[PDB]
């Protein structure tokens with residue numbers, strides 16, 4: 001690794017990670033599963049009614065957005081969503097011990113997974129959680145690759161899986 005390469009891990013954190021996985025959109029769009037989304041992976045609603053999505057948006061941002069937000073607003077919402085995922089792990093009796101056992105990079109992948117799937121979805125992954133706690137990284141990654149989460153939308157999940165396998169930021173290099 002060059003001096004620059006060794007600097008790369010210091011540039012990566014959960015925010016940069018999810019920013020790559022989720023992208024950044026300032027207008028309401030449908031995600032790979034067809035759910036109305038905005039900003040940096042902010043799921044507005046699962047309802048197919050755009051009017052519901054717009055309603056959720058105005059509630060979340062606090063003004064009349066008519067389906068459009070600013071970069072600064074996207075980032076505020078993103079920060080709130082990241083905090084919610086972290087809080088969701090730490091208060092959960094199943095997830096916290098696993099999260100605690102992980103190194104810093106895999107902890108980012110954990111927060112990412114929960115940001116994407118929610119707490120009950122992740123906590124239901126009984127085998128993966130045991131594998132991670134036991135540092136069975138290859139097995140954990142293979143099992144994650146069986147999931148609907150990954151298989152229905154591979155591009156959004158592939159880097160997270162690789163990160164659980166390696167505990168490095170390599171999947172986020174060379175975009």
Ligand SMILES: c1ccc2oncc2c1
Pocket residue numbers: 089095096098099109110111113114122129132
């Ligand atoms: C919180 C703790 C451990 C985890 O493993 N995979 C996701 C996740 C979330």
